[PDB]
PDB file of C-alpha atoms in Angstrom:
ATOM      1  CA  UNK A  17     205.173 -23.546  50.042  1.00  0.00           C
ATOM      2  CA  UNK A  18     207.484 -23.941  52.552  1.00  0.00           C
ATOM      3  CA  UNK A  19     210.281 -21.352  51.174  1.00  0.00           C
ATOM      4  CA  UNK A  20     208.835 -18.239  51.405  1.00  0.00           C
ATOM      5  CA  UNK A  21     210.768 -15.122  50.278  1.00  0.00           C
ATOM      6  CA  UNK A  22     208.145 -12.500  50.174  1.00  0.00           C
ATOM      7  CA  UNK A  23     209.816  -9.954  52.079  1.00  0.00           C
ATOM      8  CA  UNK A  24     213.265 -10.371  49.852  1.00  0.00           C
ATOM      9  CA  UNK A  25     212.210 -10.006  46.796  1.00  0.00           C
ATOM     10  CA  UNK A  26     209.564  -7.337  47.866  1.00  0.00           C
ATOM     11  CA  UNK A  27     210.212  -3.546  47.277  1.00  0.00           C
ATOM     12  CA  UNK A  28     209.475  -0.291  48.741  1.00  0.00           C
ATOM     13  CA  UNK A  29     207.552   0.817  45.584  1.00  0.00           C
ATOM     14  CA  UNK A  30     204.675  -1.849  46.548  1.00  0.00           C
ATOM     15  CA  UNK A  31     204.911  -2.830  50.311  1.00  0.00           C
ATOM     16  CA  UNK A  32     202.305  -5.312  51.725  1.00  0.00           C
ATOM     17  CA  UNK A  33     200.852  -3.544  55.403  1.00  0.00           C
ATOM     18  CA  UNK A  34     202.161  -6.407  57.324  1.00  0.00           C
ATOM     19  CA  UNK A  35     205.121  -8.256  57.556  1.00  0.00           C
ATOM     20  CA  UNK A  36     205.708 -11.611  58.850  1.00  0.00           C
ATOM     21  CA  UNK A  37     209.364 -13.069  59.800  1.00  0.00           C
ATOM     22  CA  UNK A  38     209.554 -16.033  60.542  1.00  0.00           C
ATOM     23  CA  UNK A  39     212.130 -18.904  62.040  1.00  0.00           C
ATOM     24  CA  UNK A  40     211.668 -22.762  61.882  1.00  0.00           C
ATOM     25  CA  UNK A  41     212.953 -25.370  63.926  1.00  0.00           C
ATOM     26  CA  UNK A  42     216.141 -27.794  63.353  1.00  0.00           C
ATOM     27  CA  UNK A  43     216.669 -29.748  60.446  1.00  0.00           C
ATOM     28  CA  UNK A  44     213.355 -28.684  59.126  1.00  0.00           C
ATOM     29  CA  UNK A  45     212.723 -27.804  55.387  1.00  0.00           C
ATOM     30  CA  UNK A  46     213.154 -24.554  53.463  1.00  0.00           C
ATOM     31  CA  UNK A  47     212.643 -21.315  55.831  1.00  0.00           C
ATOM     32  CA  UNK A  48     208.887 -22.305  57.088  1.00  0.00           C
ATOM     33  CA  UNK A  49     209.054 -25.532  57.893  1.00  0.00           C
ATOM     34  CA  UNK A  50     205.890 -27.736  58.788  1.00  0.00           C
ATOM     35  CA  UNK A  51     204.493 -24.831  60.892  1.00  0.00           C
ATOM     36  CA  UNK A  52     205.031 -21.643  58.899  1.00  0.00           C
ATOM     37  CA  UNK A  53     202.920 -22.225  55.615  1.00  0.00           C
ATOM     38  CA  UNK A  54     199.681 -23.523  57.825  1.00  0.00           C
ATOM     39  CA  UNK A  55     200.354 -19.927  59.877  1.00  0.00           C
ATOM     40  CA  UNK A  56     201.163 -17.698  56.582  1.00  0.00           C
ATOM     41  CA  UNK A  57     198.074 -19.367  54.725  1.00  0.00           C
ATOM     42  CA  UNK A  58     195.789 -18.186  57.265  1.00  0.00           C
ATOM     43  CA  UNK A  59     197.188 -14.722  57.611  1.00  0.00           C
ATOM     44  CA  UNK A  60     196.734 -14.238  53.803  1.00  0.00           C
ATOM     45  CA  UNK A  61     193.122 -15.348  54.328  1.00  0.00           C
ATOM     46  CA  UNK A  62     193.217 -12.290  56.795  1.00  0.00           C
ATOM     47  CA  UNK A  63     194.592  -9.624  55.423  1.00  0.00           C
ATOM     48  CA  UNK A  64     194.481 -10.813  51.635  1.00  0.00           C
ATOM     49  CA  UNK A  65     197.781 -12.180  49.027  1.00  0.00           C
ATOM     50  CA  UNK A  66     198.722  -8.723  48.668  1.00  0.00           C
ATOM     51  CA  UNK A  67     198.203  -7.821  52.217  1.00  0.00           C
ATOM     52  CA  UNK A  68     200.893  -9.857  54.018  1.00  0.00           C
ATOM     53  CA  UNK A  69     204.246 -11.010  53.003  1.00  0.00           C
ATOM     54  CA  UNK A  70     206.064 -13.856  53.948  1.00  0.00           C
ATOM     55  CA  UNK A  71     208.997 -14.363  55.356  1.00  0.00           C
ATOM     56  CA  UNK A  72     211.209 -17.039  56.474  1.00  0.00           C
ATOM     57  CA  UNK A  73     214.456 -16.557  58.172  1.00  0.00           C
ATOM     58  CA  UNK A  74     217.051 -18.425  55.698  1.00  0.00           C
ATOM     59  CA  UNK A  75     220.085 -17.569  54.714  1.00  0.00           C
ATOM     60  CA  UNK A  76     222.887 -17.527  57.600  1.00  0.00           C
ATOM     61  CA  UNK A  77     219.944 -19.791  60.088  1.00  0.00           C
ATOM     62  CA  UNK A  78     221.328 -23.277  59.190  1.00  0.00           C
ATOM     63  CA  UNK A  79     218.710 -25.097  61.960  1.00  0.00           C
ATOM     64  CA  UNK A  80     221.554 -26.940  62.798  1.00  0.00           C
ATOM     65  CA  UNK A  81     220.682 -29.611  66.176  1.00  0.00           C
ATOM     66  CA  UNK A  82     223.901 -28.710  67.847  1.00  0.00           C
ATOM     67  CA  UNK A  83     223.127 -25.370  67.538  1.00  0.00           C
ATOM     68  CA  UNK A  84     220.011 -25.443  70.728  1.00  0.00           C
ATOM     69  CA  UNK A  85     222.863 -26.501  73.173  1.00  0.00           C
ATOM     70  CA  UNK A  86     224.666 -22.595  72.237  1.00  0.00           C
ATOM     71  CA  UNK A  87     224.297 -20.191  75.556  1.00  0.00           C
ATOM     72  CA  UNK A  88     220.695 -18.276  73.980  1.00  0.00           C
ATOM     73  CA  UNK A  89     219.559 -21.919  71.968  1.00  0.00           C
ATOM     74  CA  UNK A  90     221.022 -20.507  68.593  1.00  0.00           C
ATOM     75  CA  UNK A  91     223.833 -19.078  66.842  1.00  0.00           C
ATOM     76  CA  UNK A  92     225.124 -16.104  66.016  1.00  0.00           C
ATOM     77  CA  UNK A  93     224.991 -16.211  62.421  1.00  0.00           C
ATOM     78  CA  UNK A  94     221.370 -17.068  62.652  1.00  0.00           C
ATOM     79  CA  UNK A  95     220.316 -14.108  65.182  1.00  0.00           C
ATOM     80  CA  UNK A  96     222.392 -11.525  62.607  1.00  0.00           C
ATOM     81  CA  UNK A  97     220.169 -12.922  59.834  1.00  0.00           C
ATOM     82  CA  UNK A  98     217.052 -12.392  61.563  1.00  0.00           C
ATOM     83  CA  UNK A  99     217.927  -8.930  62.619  1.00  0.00           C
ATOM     84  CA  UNK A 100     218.753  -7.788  59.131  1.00  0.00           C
ATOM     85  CA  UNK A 101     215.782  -9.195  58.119  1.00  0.00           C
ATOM     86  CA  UNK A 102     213.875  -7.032  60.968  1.00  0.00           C
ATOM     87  CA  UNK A 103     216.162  -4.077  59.703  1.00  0.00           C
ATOM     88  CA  UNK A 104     214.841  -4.928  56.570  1.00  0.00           C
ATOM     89  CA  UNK A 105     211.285  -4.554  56.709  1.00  0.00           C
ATOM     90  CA  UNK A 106     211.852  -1.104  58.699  1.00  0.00           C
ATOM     91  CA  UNK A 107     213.891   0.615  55.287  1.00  0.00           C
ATOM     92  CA  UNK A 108     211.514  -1.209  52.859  1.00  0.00           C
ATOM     93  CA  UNK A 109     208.167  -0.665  54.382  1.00  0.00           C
ATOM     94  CA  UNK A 110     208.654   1.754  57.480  1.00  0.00           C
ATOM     95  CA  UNK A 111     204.224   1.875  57.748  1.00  0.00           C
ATOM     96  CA  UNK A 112     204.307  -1.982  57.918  1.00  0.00           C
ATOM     97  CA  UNK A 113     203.213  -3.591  61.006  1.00  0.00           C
ATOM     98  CA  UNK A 114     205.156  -6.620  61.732  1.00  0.00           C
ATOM     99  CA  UNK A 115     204.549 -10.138  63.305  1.00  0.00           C
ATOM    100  CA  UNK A 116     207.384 -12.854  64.388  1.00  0.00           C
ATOM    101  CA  UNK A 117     207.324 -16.300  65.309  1.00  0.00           C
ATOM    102  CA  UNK A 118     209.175 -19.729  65.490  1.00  0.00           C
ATOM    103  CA  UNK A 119     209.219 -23.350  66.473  1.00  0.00           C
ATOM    104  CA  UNK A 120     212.217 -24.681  68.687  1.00  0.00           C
ATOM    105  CA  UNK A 121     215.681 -23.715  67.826  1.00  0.00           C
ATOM    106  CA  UNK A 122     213.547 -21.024  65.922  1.00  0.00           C
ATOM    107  CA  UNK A 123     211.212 -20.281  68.899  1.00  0.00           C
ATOM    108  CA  UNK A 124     214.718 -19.397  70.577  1.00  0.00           C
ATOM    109  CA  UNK A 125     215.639 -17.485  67.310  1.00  0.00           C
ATOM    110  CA  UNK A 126     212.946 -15.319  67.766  1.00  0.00           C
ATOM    111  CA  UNK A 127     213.681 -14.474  70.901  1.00  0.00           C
ATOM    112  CA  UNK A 128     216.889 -14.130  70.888  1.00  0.00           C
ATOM    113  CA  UNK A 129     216.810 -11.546  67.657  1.00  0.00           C
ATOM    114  CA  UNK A 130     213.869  -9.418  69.522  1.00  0.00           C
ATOM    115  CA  UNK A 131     215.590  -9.029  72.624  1.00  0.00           C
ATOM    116  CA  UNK A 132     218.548  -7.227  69.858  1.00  0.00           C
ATOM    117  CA  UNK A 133     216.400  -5.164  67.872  1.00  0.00           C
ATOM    118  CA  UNK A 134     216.628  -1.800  67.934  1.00  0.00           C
ATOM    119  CA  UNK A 135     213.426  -0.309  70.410  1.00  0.00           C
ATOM    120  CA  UNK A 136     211.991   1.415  67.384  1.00  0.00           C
ATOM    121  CA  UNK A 137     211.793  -1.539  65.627  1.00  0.00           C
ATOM    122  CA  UNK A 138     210.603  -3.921  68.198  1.00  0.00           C
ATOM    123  CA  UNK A 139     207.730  -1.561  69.198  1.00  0.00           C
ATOM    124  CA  UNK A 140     206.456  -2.240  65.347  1.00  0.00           C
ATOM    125  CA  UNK A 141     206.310  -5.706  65.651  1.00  0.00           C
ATOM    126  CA  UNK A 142     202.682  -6.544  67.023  1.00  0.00           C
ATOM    127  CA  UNK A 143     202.975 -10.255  67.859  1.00  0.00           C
ATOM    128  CA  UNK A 144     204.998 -12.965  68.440  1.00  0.00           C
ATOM    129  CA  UNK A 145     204.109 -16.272  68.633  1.00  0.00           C
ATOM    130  CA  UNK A 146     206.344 -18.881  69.808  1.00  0.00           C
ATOM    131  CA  UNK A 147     206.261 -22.683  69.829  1.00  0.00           C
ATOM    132  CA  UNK A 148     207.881 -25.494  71.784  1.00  0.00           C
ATOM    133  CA  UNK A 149     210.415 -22.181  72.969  1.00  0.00           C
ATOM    134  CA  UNK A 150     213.586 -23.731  74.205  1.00  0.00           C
ATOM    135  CA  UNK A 151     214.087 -21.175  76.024  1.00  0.00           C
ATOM    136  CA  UNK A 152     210.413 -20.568  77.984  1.00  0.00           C
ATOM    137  CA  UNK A 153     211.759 -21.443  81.314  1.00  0.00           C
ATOM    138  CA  UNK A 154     215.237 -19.107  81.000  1.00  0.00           C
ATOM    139  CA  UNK A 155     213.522 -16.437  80.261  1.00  0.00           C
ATOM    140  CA  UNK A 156     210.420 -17.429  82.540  1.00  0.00           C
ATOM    141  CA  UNK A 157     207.983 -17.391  79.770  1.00  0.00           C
ATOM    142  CA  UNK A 158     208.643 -14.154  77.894  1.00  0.00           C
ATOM    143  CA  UNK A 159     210.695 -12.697  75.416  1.00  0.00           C
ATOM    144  CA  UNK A 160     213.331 -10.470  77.326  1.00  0.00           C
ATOM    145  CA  UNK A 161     212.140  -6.585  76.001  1.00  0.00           C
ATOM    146  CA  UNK A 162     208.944  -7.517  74.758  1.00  0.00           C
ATOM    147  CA  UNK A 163     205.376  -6.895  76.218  1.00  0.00           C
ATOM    148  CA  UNK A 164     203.842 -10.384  77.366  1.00  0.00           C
ATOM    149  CA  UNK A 165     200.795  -8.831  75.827  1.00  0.00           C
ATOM    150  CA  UNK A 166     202.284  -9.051  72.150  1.00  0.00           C
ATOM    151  CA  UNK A 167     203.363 -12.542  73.088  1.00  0.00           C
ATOM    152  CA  UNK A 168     201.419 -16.051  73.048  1.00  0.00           C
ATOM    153  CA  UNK A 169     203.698 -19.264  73.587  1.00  0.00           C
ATOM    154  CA  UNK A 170     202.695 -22.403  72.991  1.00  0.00           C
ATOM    155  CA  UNK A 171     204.291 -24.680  75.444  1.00  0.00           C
ATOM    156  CA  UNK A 172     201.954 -28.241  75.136  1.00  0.00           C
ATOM    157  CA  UNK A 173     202.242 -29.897  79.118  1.00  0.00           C
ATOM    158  CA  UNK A 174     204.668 -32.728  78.236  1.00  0.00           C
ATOM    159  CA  UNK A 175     206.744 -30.750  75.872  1.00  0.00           C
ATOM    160  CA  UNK A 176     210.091 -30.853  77.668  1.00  0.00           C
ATOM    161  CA  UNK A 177     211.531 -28.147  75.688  1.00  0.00           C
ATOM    162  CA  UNK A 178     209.187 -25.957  77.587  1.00  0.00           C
ATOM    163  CA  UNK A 179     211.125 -26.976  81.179  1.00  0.00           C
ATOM    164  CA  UNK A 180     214.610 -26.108  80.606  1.00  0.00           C
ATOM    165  CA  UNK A 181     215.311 -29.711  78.591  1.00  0.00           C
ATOM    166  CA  UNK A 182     216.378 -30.421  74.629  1.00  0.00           C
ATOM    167  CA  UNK A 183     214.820 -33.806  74.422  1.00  0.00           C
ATOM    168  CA  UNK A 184     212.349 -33.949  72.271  1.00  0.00           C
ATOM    169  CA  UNK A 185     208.644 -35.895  73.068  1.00  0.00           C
ATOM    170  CA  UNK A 186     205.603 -36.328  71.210  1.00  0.00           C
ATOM    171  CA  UNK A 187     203.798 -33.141  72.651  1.00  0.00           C
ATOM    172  CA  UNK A 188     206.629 -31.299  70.893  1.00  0.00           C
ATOM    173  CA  UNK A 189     205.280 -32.564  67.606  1.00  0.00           C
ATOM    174  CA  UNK A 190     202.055 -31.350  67.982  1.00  0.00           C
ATOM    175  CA  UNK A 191     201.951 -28.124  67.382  1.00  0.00           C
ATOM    176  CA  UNK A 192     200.240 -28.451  63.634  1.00  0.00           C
ATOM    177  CA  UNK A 193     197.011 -27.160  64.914  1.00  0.00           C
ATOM    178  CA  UNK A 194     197.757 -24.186  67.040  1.00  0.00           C
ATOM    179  CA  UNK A 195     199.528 -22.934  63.877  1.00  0.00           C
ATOM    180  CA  UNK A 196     196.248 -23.343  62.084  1.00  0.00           C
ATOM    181  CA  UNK A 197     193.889 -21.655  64.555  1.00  0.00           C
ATOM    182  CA  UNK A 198     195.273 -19.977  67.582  1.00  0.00           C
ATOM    183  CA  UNK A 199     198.831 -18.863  66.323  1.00  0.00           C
ATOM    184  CA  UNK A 200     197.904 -16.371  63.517  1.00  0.00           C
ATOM    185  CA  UNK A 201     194.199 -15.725  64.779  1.00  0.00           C
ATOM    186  CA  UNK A 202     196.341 -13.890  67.699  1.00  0.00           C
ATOM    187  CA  UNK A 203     198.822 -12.353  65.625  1.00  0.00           C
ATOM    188  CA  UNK A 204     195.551 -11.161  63.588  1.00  0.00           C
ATOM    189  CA  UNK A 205     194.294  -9.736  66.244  1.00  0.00           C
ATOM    190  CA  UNK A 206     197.335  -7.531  67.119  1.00  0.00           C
ATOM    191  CA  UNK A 207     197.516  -6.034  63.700  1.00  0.00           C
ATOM    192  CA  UNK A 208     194.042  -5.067  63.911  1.00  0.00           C
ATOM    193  CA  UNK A 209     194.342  -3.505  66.961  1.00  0.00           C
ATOM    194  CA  UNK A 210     197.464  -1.889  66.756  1.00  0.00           C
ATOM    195  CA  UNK A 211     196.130  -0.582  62.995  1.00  0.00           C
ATOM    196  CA  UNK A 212     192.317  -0.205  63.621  1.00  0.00           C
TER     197      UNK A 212
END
């Protein structure tokens, strides 16, 4: 459950409405990790199996520890991949809306890779939800190009990832129940706004 290649092996002859990338932290399994399958098991409760696809940024994004300490918390390889994947869901299923998220190195992945995309793009994705972001105090809370209003970032008091640091505390490994509730009930909620 946590490799997820929905979007991948998906077609444009049957596109789901929806369209969720998204990137995991360092070192963690598969492309969900422990966050993305809690998060991608709701939204299908949502919007239905055949609703919503799935989609974890593999490939190219290693999650590779080193890798947080590069100048936007990631590399290069790893924002390419998640801007083809982006690209992607535009040529496949141009009606799709689209959702993003990440944990750590990944919360900085998403970030990084929205900031990128193409304007057109970017203005389908609905939300973006973000946890422990490595980057929340660079970029003072926001994703640089994106409406606050599409984003919600989990940032636990305590979590020093959140401040500008790269240790990593307890409050960091916490976030198993905001991807349960919170997370995709918000990213829900855009969808069915932006869709009706």
């Amino acid at each position: 459950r946590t490799t997820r290649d929905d979007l991948i092996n998906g077609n444009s002859a049957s596109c789901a409405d929806v369209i969720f990338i998204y990137a995991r932290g360092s070192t963690e399994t598969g492309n969900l990790g422990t966050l993305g399958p809690s998060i991608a098991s709701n939204l299908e409760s949502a919007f239905g199996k055949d609703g919503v696809w799935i989609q974890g940024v593999g490939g190219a994004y290693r999650a590779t520890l080193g890798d947080n300490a590069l100048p936007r918390g990631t590399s290069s390889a790893a924002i390419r991949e998640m801007l083809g994947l982006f690209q992607q869901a535009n040529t496949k299923c141009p009606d799709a809306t689209l959702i993003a998220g990440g944990y750590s190195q990944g919360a900085a992945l998403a970030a990084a890779s929205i900031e990128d995309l193409d304007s057109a793009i970017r203005d389908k994705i609905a939300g973006t939800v973000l946890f422990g972001y490595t980057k929340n105090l660079q970029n003072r809370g926001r994703i640089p190009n994106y409406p606050a209003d599409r984003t919600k970032v989990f940032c636990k008091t305590g979590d020093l990832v959140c401040t500008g640091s790269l240790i990593v505390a307890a409050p960091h490994l916490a976030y198993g129940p905001d991807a349960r509730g919170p997370a995709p009930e918000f990213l829900i909620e855009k969808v069915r706004a932006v869709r009706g």
